[PDB]
Point group: C2
Chain length 48, copies 2
């Protein structure tokens, strides 16, 4: 339930707080979309 999976915009740039990821996939079927997992592994000792 804690996964945060967002949809990739048309310009291909997803922002994750200061970090920018450039994603371009060719030959994507017309009934499908591209998603990015934005917190696959995370670790921290304080909440903020």
């Amino acid at each position: 339930e804690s996964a945060e999976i967002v949809e990739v915009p048309e310009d291909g740039i997803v922002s994750i707080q200061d970090a920018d990821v450039y994603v371009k996939i060719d030959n994507v079927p017309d009934n499908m979309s591209v998603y990015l997992h934005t917190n696959l592994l995370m670790f921290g000792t304080r909440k903020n």
Copy 2:
């Protein structure tokens, strides 16, 4: 313009990301309210 001044709730507890401030003022006039300055001095090297 960068000041973030919020109004104190009825229970007197304001949360500032994990930190809690307890504010109780006596004899407040009925046409006035209590506000708290939540970022008087701040310093950081990265945006997040």
